[PDB]
Every structure is written in structure tokens, then in C-alpha cells.
Design a protein around this ligand. Structure first.
Ligand code: K
Ligand code: K
Ligand code: K
Ligand code: K
Ligand code: K
Ligand code: K
Ligand code: K
Ligand code: K
Ligand code: K
Ligand code: K
Ligand code: K
Ligand code: K
Ligand code: K
Ligand code: K
Ligand code: MG
Ligand code: MG
Ligand code: MG
Ligand code: MG
Ligand code: MG
Ligand code: MG
Ligand code: MG
Ligand code: MG
Ligand code: MG
Ligand code: MG
Ligand code: MG
Ligand code: MG
Ligand code: MG
Ligand code: MG
Ligand code: MG
Ligand code: MG
Ligand code: MG
Ligand code: MG
Ligand code: MG
Ligand code: MG
Ligand code: MG
Ligand code: MG
Ligand code: MG
Ligand code: MG
Ligand code: MG
Ligand code: MG
Ligand code: MG
Ligand code: MG
Ligand code: MG
Ligand code: MG
Ligand code: MG
Ligand code: MG
Ligand code: MG
Ligand code: MG
Ligand code: MG
Ligand code: MG
Ligand code: MG
Ligand code: MG
Ligand code: MG
Ligand code: MG
Ligand code: MG
Ligand code: MG
Ligand code: MG
Ligand code: MG
Ligand code: MG
Ligand code: MG
Ligand code: MG
Ligand code: MG
Ligand code: MG
Ligand code: MG
Ligand code: MG
Ligand code: MG
Ligand code: MG
Ligand code: MG
Ligand code: MG
Lengths: 68, 89, 50, 80, 106, 50, 245
RNA sequence: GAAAGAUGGUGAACUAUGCCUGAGCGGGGCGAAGCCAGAGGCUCUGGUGGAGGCUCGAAGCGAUACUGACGUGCAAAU
RNA sequence: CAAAUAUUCAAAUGAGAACUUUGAAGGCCGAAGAGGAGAAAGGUUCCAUGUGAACGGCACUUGCACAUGGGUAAGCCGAUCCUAAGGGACGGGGUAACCCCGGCAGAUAGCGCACGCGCCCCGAAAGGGAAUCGGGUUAAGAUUUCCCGAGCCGGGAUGUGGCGGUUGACGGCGACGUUAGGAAGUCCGGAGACGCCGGCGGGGGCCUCGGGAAGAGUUAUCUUUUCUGCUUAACGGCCUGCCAACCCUGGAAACGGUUCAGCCGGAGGUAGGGUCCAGUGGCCGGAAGAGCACCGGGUGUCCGGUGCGCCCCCGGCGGCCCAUGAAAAUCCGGAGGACCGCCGUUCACGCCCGGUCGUACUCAUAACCGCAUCAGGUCUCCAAGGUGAACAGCCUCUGGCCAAUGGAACAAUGUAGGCAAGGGAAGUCGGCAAAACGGAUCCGUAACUUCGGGAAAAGGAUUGGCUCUGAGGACCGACUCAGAACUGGUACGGACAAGGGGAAUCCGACUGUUUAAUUAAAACAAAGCAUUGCGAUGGUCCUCGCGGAUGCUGACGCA
């Protein structure tokens, strides 16, 4: 497993062809976005409520999205 | 202190006879002594094995006597070899 | 390798993996897991074991 | 036990060395006294000549604890 | 106190069977098998350690398993000779070569 | 042991099959003299030296 | 009777030498053109211990005369040799301790070790620690040389035989008392299965000619013919004299 | 109905010894060299240090005495 | 039918219960176990259901018996690969043949890119070694094979992006750093890769003290109390950076730095500033969604302290040797630069694949051997609290057990274990057996001596509980050691544990060894002493023969 820091790098990874699904995990602190790729699971931590929503709406329409 | 005559040989206790302990004393002392290194100029040469004498700091290793760095005949042989070499010329 | 090729030529199904063992009675037993989109219960009905 | 009960001669089965080794006591004394000497060389309470002389006297078993060592330092500096 | 067992069929405390105790998220203690301590690269003329390279088992240095910066040092005789050894060889190579010319002239 | 050669396991499988009671209908045959197996072995007695 | 212990050693079953941790044969480099006509320089890289051998060995590296290769040698170290020292082998090598020379190049009185008996032997004489041979005289007509061996015997060798200059390192080893059966046990543990020796008088007659009796005694002269059969040849063999002079 | 003799074979899973490669042996007592300081002029005093086919002893290994028990034994040696 | 402390009550089932099952109680093993798992060996003994007889030396409803079925899943665990001591073996040699010989060298049977080079196999499930983790799941498996999730290794094809062309990258004085960043034959180095002993330091786990919250126990009295739990894997990124090692500046006597011990410095110390190294270290991802504990979906999964503590691993010193303590496969690095341009790329991401055999169970007072379900024998890992010097003995927790035919009664004689007034070896071949001594602290200790010992010589005194006091530290704490008062039926190493001492003679120097199953010794060995042979065309020895051991040896050696 690997962590992603900036939002844009998560955007390109979720747009990868080998990306299969995105899991959204809600914690009491932040919101974790996990995209399952071929070799690694990439996790990005969003500490902002609206940035989580903007990320949710701006995801690629072709990728599956799951709520955890 | 701690002993009047035994010295290093007191590790053997009362065993083996007084004459044998006195015999081994000189070689026990000499083989555990620190010798002068002609290459670097320090008293850092220690016996690594019988005949092998290595300096701690400069790292030179030298073939010498069994229980002393230079045997008496080694000095005599070197002088004979040196005199033969010069007189050969 | 021969096992997964055999199940394909016999039942027209695709095996994801094959685990084999030799039983204490001396025979060989194969565990053939089918790929998703193949339903073993349907295959079991066609063969006749259910 | 902390108050000191049950610690008389009728309760001791090992030797004094087997209970608290003399080497452990000596190691604690050196570390305590060498730390104090280093603490005084820094902060300039003593100079390097005094420190070296006291370091060899500590190894020579001249001071049995801290209070003896500080008193010796004060008396040594009392010269002028 | 949660005594432990070996997890494979090696029953003897050999150097290749060394274990460590770890706590799992299951709240228990299990054995994990470690790797034997390995020397790193060594210098043949000084005997000292070669700086800049980790101390691994020989097959952990494999190219597919280790990055190139970790494997090498950027100097002639990089992972083979230390800096002091390389300086001495350069100076010896040049100074003896000058002596060869002086022998030729004289 | 748990660690077995294949050839040892194959022989152990055959010996497992061979120590069964004789079928009951064998005793009903026309000219039958067989009473019991005469070759049953129990593991605790009569070890097979392999 | 039964086969005696002296006879059983020739089968070499449990009496073979213990050589599992030995560093290799110690000997000169094979004689070649460069040594036969000039000199070749090698450098001493290590002075190491060889189990079962009193004398230290010297690891020496040469450059191959015609191949692009290193040539690593290992012979008995003369006293005074050291790591990083240049040694020279051949006809034109200087008379210095650690150098390998033909006997023709060593004047009368020289101290030598690892002396060849045949030209190209790689060293046969004076190899144990502290031992050496002395050059006595030279014969230019026959091309032979006279040397004195450590046992005192004179020997005639070809003048082309090679020897190292100096005496073998590690001398004085046997002047130290062993003091313990255990020290003797460790000495012979890395040599051979020979150390704890049982006296023949302490045996039964089936095992030894000295065995038997109601007192421990040989019962016949311990001096024995040179031509006695094995099993019979025990004691002092072909002795010209006995006793302490 | 011998004690034997001979021919040709099988065993070092017990035990004997050599070799290779592994594994193992609490806690105490005594306190050798080397080293520090003090006093004297190398000696004395106090420390430090931790040697030895040293010692009391746990595991292990062994087997002295009761000539104990048993002696158709738990056991052809416990 | 008596070793290994031990059973009792109620109920159930059943024709039948001292022996089966459940619950309760009383006990034992006491963590170098009667606990939890392996290697050999066994081979179905493993699990379920059922029960005619036999068997389980009494019994059984019951089973390690019997009958019928079921059960062992791997690219990552092993074997497999490599070599060790060693074994076999082509040609050749010997031999009537069976067969016995491997260094005796025989066109060595082939390897890279015509050209170039050229010094067999077997043998380790404890040696070396590609790569896995956590959680879940069965009647029986998986202590890493199945499921969930998350990785890794090896191999093979292929792009997309990046990177280099001063053809083969930058930065740093330097140690060295950065995910990339030419290259053939040839050559060189390292890792693999190594003994024993003693301190010291570090990390992980465990033990231990406190706080908080959750639940449980006790509760006539007391107890902010006693108990339980409060977790975080491989793998990836960033940080940190021990103890050593290294670099730059500078130039030291009034020498300094420094360890428990050492030791270090003009061959450059102290000091100042840095590089690297390893971690089973920290944070984040994995990952709270899991697991656990509570309450009926919900809550919580937190904060500190301490150490000559115990186990494992690591680091770094010291000591010891007439002892110097494997090899190979495999992997990495380097020297050189023939050759080459739209071609190079050890980079990231992406695609495909991963064979065969073992895997259940026991591992022992019942699964192995001893004719047996035999008090014997049989290699390992883990290992808690108290007392205490302590893996001693004794008691306890986890886990496991009450299986060793049962009942009645206490004769002689036994066996095992005790006590005994007065005497104290008078007993007996003989103090055999038993008793006495025993820990710790203080005092004190002879002859003799190889000066090291003898020595714990001998001989005396003390020891409980309680209430205090003093000393010894770090940046608030832990044990130790001294001192005092009081006090008890003078008892106090209160059980346990734990030398009897002295004066001499004989033998053997000592430590070691030995007649497995009647002799442990004065016997054997041993260091020391002495003698003999031998310079290799040799001595000693083996072999039918050919040949071989000493010998990887050379008189400080071999015999
Ligand atoms: K590097
Ligand atoms: K015979
Ligand atoms: K022997
Ligand atoms: K003897
Ligand atoms: K006789
Ligand atoms: K496999
Ligand atoms: K192996
Ligand atoms: K090894
Ligand atoms: K791993
Ligand atoms: K299994
Ligand atoms: K048994
Ligand atoms: K009675
Ligand atoms: K008497
Ligand atoms: K010979
Ligand atoms: Mg202690
Ligand atoms: Mg059996
Ligand atoms: Mg048979
Ligand atoms: Mg006899
Ligand atoms: Mg005879
Ligand atoms: Mg007859
Ligand atoms: Mg006859
Ligand atoms: Mg054997
Ligand atoms: Mg001391
Ligand atoms: Mg001893
Ligand atoms: Mg003893
Ligand atoms: Mg007797
Ligand atoms: Mg008896
Ligand atoms: Mg009887
Ligand atoms: Mg009986
Ligand atoms: Mg019973
Ligand atoms: Mg008990
Ligand atoms: Mg108990
Ligand atoms: Mg079990
Ligand atoms: Mg069962
Ligand atoms: Mg019965
Ligand atoms: Mg059955
Ligand atoms: Mg399989
Ligand atoms: Mg594996
Ligand atoms: Mg091979
Ligand atoms: Mg071999
Ligand atoms: Mg042949
Ligand atoms: Mg093999
Ligand atoms: Mg292995
Ligand atoms: Mg299981
Ligand atoms: Mg020691
Ligand atoms: Mg500095
Ligand atoms: Mg996390
Ligand atoms: Mg949860
Ligand atoms: Mg342990
Ligand atoms: Mg290059
Ligand atoms: Mg243990
Ligand atoms: Mg205590
Ligand atoms: Mg205990
Ligand atoms: Mg019984
Ligand atoms: Mg009875
Ligand atoms: Mg009485
Ligand atoms: Mg009396
Ligand atoms: Mg009498
Ligand atoms: Mg009488
Ligand atoms: Mg009498
Ligand atoms: Mg007695
Ligand atoms: Mg006495
Ligand atoms: Mg007399
Ligand atoms: Mg004796
Ligand atoms: Mg003895
Ligand atoms: Mg014996
Ligand atoms: Mg006997
Ligand atoms: Mg006896
Ligand atoms: Mg004598």
C-alpha cells in the first residue's frame, strides 16, 4: 500500500485504465480515498469536508465507487 | 603485591611442579608482551599465532619467533646474510 | 496443467486454479476452482452430481 | 521492604556480593563521578588540568561519593 | 504468558532458524523468522567497511530487488576500494611512473 | 513421519486397502473353505518393516 | 595373536592425517624460464597460520610470465618476512632473506631453508619451524653443492636447486613445556590419531610382544633386528647402542 | 548326544575409535597477569580487572555405599 | 493385582454405573511441567456414527478394540539446488573371473560470440539457500496450503511515459548523495563465510509500579480496593540515526581525551562541523472496515514510570590457543574500452505465467524400541507469580489432570519413614546404617608448603517482629548497606534448603579414563625424562596383485 499526498496525483491514478474501484472510508478526523490499482492500493487523506465532496463529484464516471 | 614470585604463572595454582612453572614463566611473559614496530615506531606488535606478529595500528604482519618477536638466531642469520651479500659484491 | 485442459475439453468451463493431493487410499484428488462467471452449482446440475 | 523491614541478618541467604555485586557498585560510582567531573569542566568550574588530575584520582579510588569529590575540588581551588 | 511454538518443521535452534516475537492485531504473540546478520562490502587493502552500501544477504543485493544508487559508489573502484585506498593507488601510480622516466634519463 | 517418500506412501496405501474383512457373499459360494482374512494386521502388533 | 597397533596404521583407516582445515601445500612456484635466467618479483599479502604446522606460511602474489592473470603462491615463511614486502625469485635475485635463489648463487656459509633435492622439486629440506640448512662448499666441475641438513648430515645437491634465504619462522616452539594432557590433546587433534599411547607392557600378549606377565616387563631384549617381520618389529629397531651416555 | 575344524556370506539401528556438520552446560566462592591512585625510595597500602584441564553446586553426563528394595521383578541390570 | 499424595456429592444415560457424561467441591503436575509444538520411528492410531463376541490382566453404557464412512489443497513451508567428511565411476592398471584400484593424465567428450577460449555424478527435511503477512474458516486442515484482504519472488513478452546524447546524466572541497544515466572477449575484489570465554551497551518480547475508563469478585467490619482485558502483521514512504568506521577545518607540554576494563593522538588529539552504517526504533499508509472487551446496532480500544530483572537478537571491546576454529552454489561491485547513433536505457507504470512429491495424527508412565497399553531407553523449541543468590526445594496462575481394580479391618513378620530416659561404639571384620554439621554477617585461623596453597582450617559471636534514623542518585525515583529504640515463653537461615571436624601412615603427582550386567582402583592415560630408526633411491606400515597410509608431511618432522 502507498499514500498519495496531493489531490491531483490521485486524480490521474483514478483515471488509470488498470484502476478498478474507489473506496471512501470516513473517519472521525478525515476522509480516506483508496483506489485499487493493479499492483498497489493508493490512499489519499482529505482533511476537508468540501474537498472530499469536490473529489467525490469529480471522479471519473467510468470508475466504480464504493462507500465504506 | 598479590604475589611474591609467581606473577603470570599464578594462574596454574599448585600444579605441574615449581621448576616447570618457572620454566614456562619466561615464554608466558614474552609471548604476551608488546613489541616495537620498526615500520611505524609504536609498541603495538602482538602475537596472533605462533610465529605471527601483527601490529595493531599500522597493520603490518611479520613472521617471527614462536614466543618472541625476534629470535636470537634471527639477528645472527640476518648479519651473516648481510655480510655475505656485501662481500659477494 | 493437464487437469485444467481436461475440464475445459470435457465441460467447457474455465478453471481459475487447481489444487491436487494424493489421498491415503492412493488415488489423486483435484480441487478445481472455476473462474467467476462460471457457477459450479449449474455445472454440478449438468454433470448429475446434484 | 522499602521501609526497611525483613532485611536483617536472619533474612539473608546469599552473600553480600551475590545480593549486590561490588562491580555494580564500582560501575555506578565511576559513572556518577565522571559525569560530575564532565559537568564541571563545562560551565568552567574546573579547567582541563584539574579535570585530568581528578579523573585519575577517581579511578584511583580516592573519593567514595559526590560530596567527598566536590569538597576536594573546593579545597583544591582554595589555594589562592 | 503465551508460550510460543515454531511455525515450520525446523525443530533446532540453528542460526538459520532464528526467530523474533511480534504482537499481532489479533492480540497474541507469534514467531517471525528473521534473516541472519550479514557483513557488508569490505575493503581488501584496509579491511574496513565500504561506506554507502547496506549490509544485506547476498541475494538481497540482486538488481531486480535493490536500487542502483544503493548498490554502487560514484568513484573509481566504487564499492571495491575505500577512499584512502584509491588515493594511495593514484599517488603510487603517478609517483612510480615519474621514477621510471627518471631512471630512463639517468 | 509426516515427511514421506512417494514410494513409501504408495505401499502404505495398498496395505490400508488389504486389511478389510472378507465379503460375506464369498462364504456362500459353492465350494468355499475361506473363513477369515488370515492376513489382517493391526498397527500396534505385527509392524511392517519398511 | 591379533594385529598390533603399529601394523594397523598402514591401512590408513582411522590413522589418516587430519587435513580438513589446511591451507594447501607450501612450496616454491614451478621452475620456469624467468626464474632459470633472471628474477621475478612477488609481493607478500598475508602471513597465516596452518593447522598442524608449526611454521607460518606466506601468501605471495606474482604476475604470470605470459598470461594476463595473477599467480598466487604459498610457501613456508622465513623469519623476518612481512606483508607488503617484495620477494624475488630466480638466478639474478639478490641475497636477501625471503628471496628464492639457486644454490649456485648462495656463497659458502649461507643460511637457507626449503631446499630442493631435485631441480624443480619446489623445496624438500629444512621446512619445519626454526630449521635451516647451511651451504658448506661448491663444486664447479660436477656442478654440485654441499649443504648441511638440520639433523647434521651432509648432502650433495645440484647447484641449480632452489632455496629461500634465511631460516624458517616460528623457532623456539618446543622449548615451552606442554604442562597438560589437554595441551597435547589439542596439538595432535589437528595432526593424526596418535597421541594417547598405551605402553606395550600394559597390554595382553595377544596384542603386543611386550604384553603379558605377572609383572609389567618386556622379558626379552627391546632391541630388534632390522629385518624382523611387521608385528615383531617393536621396541628399539636396529639400534647400534642403548642407554644414556 | 560334544567341545571343535572348514567353505562361502550378513551385520558399526548397541558399543569402540577417526572424520564432517549441528545443538547444549543456573546461581555462588577463590581471586593470576595487566591497569589506577597514595606513601616511600623498585618497595608498601587500597582499589580495579577477571585468569585457571580452580572450587561449591542447577540441567546434563556418570555410578561410590547401603553389599537397601526387588530378585517366577515394573525391569534378561530396574 | 500395594511406586508416581485423592477422592466426594447430586443428576443424567443405560438391562446393568466405584470406573461413561454434566455440574459442584477437595486435591496434584507447578511451568529444564503430568502444559503447548517438532525431528527420527510408526502408518490411519486422526474425525463421525454404530456395537454380537474377543481385547482394554476388576469393570464399562465405554475405545489407541471392532464395523461402516470421511479426512492431508502451496510459485512463497520443505524436499528439490550447492557443496562437507565421504561414496561411486569413463579410460587406463591388476585380476581365471566375480571383482579391486582415481591421479595414474588419456585427442576429456565442451563453452563464448567462421573466430576466440579450454588448468562426471551421488552425498545434509539441524551446514549454505529466490520470494508472505495479518484476520477468518472444519467433526476432523491450514501452528504461513482453503477464504478475505494486502504483498513479494522468478521467468517471459510488450507497450506508454520518463531519462541520455559535450555519444554514454547531474550534485558535493570531501566522506558521499540522487528513482534512470553505453558496451565484448579478458581480468580483479567482496558478500556467502564461520571458534571458545568475559564484561559493557542497544532493540524486541515478558515481568513489574501508577493513572484513566469497561466489566466481574469481596463487602457483619475494612478495602478511591482485588481480578481480567484496554491490540496493531508482512510490505511501502518519510524521519531518526546508536556503538563503531569515514570526511573537512585547525594544529596540541602546564600534555590532553577517555572505558566497568581498555585505550587514543603531529602517521594529526581535544574541539567545531558533517558522511555513512542498523534497528526487532518513530510517524503515516496497510488499518479499524480487523480483533478484543462491554452495553443493548452503540461505546471504547488511553496516559505515564521503572530495572546488576528473565528470554532472544544485535553492537563494540577484552582474553585464550605448540588449538586459530568448512566449502560450493548463488549474488553484488569493480579495472579495461575493442564496438556502436535515431539508438541506448540496471527507471516508473502496464500485460502473461508459475511443474512434481510430502502435508492427517502420536512423538510417549498407551501411537517409537524394549515379545505388552513394560516405573526402562529415545534429539529439540517455548516457559509466568512468591520465597530465595538461584531454571534449588516448597506453595500458586495459564494449560492439563485425579489414570494407575475396588470394599472391610489394623495380627505376627516385612517394606518405607520417625522418636526414645541413662550411657555413648561397650555393637561389628570394620561406626555399616543413622545422628550430628550446614545459609548469611562479624571476629579469628596452625603445622606444613612446589610460596600458588593449606583455608569454609581450627575456634568463637550474631540472625525474629515492630517503630524509626543515616548514607549512597537522576533530571522525581530504585534498591543496597550501616545504626538505634521498643518488643515476644531465648524465639528467630523457625518449613525448605544446607561442609561434620582433627592427628597421622600406604599408594597414585594433580584434572582425565576403565572391566555395558559382581572389581572405579594402587590399574590405564598424562605432562616431564630418556632411548631407537630415518635425508625420500628413506624409515615405519598396509595390499593377492596393481598400488596405498604417514604425506596438503621433511629432523622444532615422522615412526
Ligand atoms: K551508495
Ligand atoms: K592375526
Ligand atoms: K586417540
Ligand atoms: K603410556
Ligand atoms: K611381558
Ligand atoms: K514447491
Ligand atoms: K538443505
Ligand atoms: K557454516
Ligand atoms: K516478510
Ligand atoms: K499440514
Ligand atoms: K511409553
Ligand atoms: K504389620
Ligand atoms: K567400635
Ligand atoms: K613411503
Ligand atoms: Mg549477583
Ligand atoms: Mg510397537
Ligand atoms: Mg520381518
Ligand atoms: Mg591387563
Ligand atoms: Mg606375541
Ligand atoms: Mg551330531
Ligand atoms: Mg584341526
Ligand atoms: Mg555409528
Ligand atoms: Mg574486584
Ligand atoms: Mg574443574
Ligand atoms: Mg567440582
Ligand atoms: Mg562395596
Ligand atoms: Mg543389594
Ligand atoms: Mg521378595
Ligand atoms: Mg507387588
Ligand atoms: Mg479410578
Ligand atoms: Mg510436590
Ligand atoms: Mg502443588
Ligand atoms: Mg497436540
Ligand atoms: Mg479418537
Ligand atoms: Mg477384563
Ligand atoms: Mg481399527
Ligand atoms: Mg502439494
Ligand atoms: Mg522455501
Ligand atoms: Mg553439482
Ligand atoms: Mg570430497
Ligand atoms: Mg575398469
Ligand atoms: Mg545433491
Ligand atoms: Mg538448511
Ligand atoms: Mg491440525
Ligand atoms: Mg577463561
Ligand atoms: Mg567533533
Ligand atoms: Mg495505520
Ligand atoms: Mg471495531
Ligand atoms: Mg531459553
Ligand atoms: Mg568503466
Ligand atoms: Mg528454555
Ligand atoms: Mg527476593
Ligand atoms: Mg524454582
Ligand atoms: Mg499398579
Ligand atoms: Mg486394596
Ligand atoms: Mg537415647
Ligand atoms: Mg559423651
Ligand atoms: Mg570393639
Ligand atoms: Mg565384641
Ligand atoms: Mg578384628
Ligand atoms: Mg556414613
Ligand atoms: Mg585440614
Ligand atoms: Mg613411614
Ligand atoms: Mg590418581
Ligand atoms: Mg583423577
Ligand atoms: Mg563407562
Ligand atoms: Mg562391572
Ligand atoms: Mg561398581
Ligand atoms: Mg621425574
Amino acid at each position: 500500500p502507498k499514500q498519495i499526498h496531493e489531490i491531483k496525483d490521485f486524480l490521474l491514478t483514478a483515471r488509470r485504465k488498470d484502476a478498478r474501484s474507489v473506496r471512501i472510508k470516513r473517519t472521525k478526523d478525515a476522509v480516506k480515498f483508496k483506489v485499487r490499482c493493479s499492483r498497489y492500493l493508493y490512499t489519499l487523506c482529505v482533511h476537508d469536508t468540501d474537498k472530499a465532496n469536490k473529489l467525490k463529484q469529480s471522479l471519473p464516471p467510468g470508475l466504480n465507487v464504493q462507500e465504506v | 603485591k598479590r604475589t611474591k614470585k609467581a606473577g603470570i604463572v599464578g594462574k596454574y595454582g599448585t600444579r605441574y611442579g615449581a621448576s616447570l612453572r618457572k620454566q614456562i614463566k619466561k615464554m608466558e611473559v614474552s609471548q604476551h608482551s608488546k613489541y616495537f614496530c620498526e615500520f611505524c615506531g609504536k609498541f603495538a606488535v602482538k602475537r596472533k599465532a605462533v610465529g605471527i606478529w601483527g601490529c595493531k595500528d599500522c597493520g603490518k604482519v611479520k613472521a617471527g619467533g614462536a614466543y618472541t618477536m625476534n629470535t636470537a638466531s634471527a639477528v645472527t642469520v640476518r648479519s651473516t646474510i648481510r655480510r655475505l651479500r656485501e662481500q659477494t659484491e | 496443467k493437464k487437469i485444467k485442459a481436461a475440464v475445459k475439453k470435457m465441460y467447457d468451463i474455465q478453471a481459475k486454479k487447481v489444487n491436487t493431493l494424493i489421498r491415503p487410499d492412493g488415488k489423486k484428488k483435484a480441487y478445481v476452482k472455476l473462474t467467476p462467471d462460471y457457477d459450479a452449482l449449474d455445472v454440478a446440475n449438468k454433470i448429475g452430481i446434484i | 521492604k522499602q521501609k526497611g523491614r525483613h532485611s536483617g541478618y536472619g533474612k539473608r541467604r546469599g552473600t553480600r556480593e551475590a545480593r549486590l555485586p561490588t562491580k555494580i557498585l564500582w560501575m555506578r560510582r565511576m559513572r556518577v563521578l565522571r559525569r560530575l567531573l564532565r559537568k564541571y569542566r563545562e560551565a568552567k568550574k574546573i579547567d582541563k588540568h584539574m579535570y585530568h588530575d581528578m579523573y585519575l584520582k577517581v579511578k584511583g579510588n580516592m573519593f567514595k561519593n559526590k560530596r567527598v569529590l566536590m569538597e576536594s575540588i573546593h579545597k583544591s581551588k582554595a589555594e589562592k | 504468558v503465551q508460550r510460543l511454538t515454531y511455525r515450520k518443521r525446523h525443530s533446532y535452534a540453528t542460526k538459520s532458524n532464528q526467530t523474533r516475537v511480534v504482537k499481532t492485531p489479533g492480540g497474541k504473540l507469534v514467531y517471525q523468522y528473521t534473516k541472519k546478520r550479514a557483513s557488508g562490502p569490505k575493503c581488501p587493502v584496509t579491511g574496513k567497511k565500504i561506506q554507502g552500501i547496506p549490509h544485506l544477504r547476498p541475494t538481497e543485493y540482486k538488481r531486480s530487488r535493490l536500487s542502483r544508487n544503493r548498490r554502487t559508489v560514484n568513484r573509481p573502484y566504487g564499492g571495491v576500494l575505500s577512499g584512502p585506498a584509491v588515493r594511495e593507488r593514484i599517488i603510487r601510480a603517478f609517483l612510480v611512473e615519474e621514477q621510471k622516466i627518471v631512471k630512463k634519463v639517468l | 513421519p509426516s515427511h514421506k517418500t512417494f514410494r513409501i506412501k504408495q505401499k502404505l496405501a495398498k496395505k490400508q486397502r488389504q486389511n478389510r474383512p472378507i465379503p460375506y457373499w464369498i462364504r456362500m459360494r459353492t465350494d468355499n473353505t475361506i473363513r477369515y482374512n488370515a492376513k489382517r494386521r493391526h498397527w500396534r502388533r505385527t509392524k511392517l518393516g519398511f | 595373536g591379533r594385529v598390533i597397533r603399529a601394523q594397523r596404521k598402514g591401512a590408513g583407516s582411522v590413522f589418516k592425517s587430519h587435513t580438513h582445515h589446511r591451507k594447501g601445500p607450501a612450496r616454491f612456484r614451478s621452475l620456469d624460464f624467468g626464474e632459470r635466467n633472471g628474477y621475478l618479483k612477488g609481493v607478500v599479502t598475508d602471513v597465516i597460520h596452518d593447522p598442524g604446522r608449526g611454521a607460518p606460511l606466506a601468501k605471495v602474489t606474482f604476475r604470470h610470465p605470459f598470461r594476463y592473470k595473477h599467480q598466487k603462491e604459498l610457501f613456508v615463511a622465513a623469519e623476518g618476512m612481512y606483508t607488503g614486502q617484495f620477494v624475488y625469485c630466480g638466478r639474478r635475485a639478490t641475497l636477501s632473506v625471503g628471496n628464492v635463489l639457486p644454490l649456485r648463487s648462495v656463497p659458502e656459509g649461507g643460511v637457507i631453508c626449503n631446499v630442493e633435492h631435485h631441480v624443480g622439486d619446489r623445496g624438500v629440506f629444512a621446512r619445519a619451524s626454526g630449521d635451516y640448512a647451511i651451504v658448506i662448499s661448491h663444486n664447479p666441475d660436477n656442478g654440485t653443492s654441499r649443504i648441511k641438513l638440520p639433523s647434521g648430515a651432509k648432502k650433495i645437491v645440484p647447484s641449480s636447486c632452489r632455496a629461500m634465504i634465511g631460516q624458517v619462522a616460528g623457532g623456539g616452539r618446543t622449548e615451552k613445556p606442554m604442562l597438560k594432557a589437554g595441551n597435547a590433546y589439542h596439538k595432535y587433534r589437528v595432526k593424526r590419531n596418535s597421541w594417547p599411547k598405551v605402553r606395550g607392557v600394559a597390554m595382553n600378549p595377544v596384542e603386543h610382544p611386550h604384553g603379558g606377565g605377572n609383572h609389567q616387563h618386556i622379558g626379552h631384549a627391546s632391541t630388534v633386528r632390522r629385518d624382523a617381520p611387521p608385528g615383531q618389529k617393536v621396541g628399539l629397531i636396529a639400534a647400534r647402542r642403548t642407554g644414556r651416555l
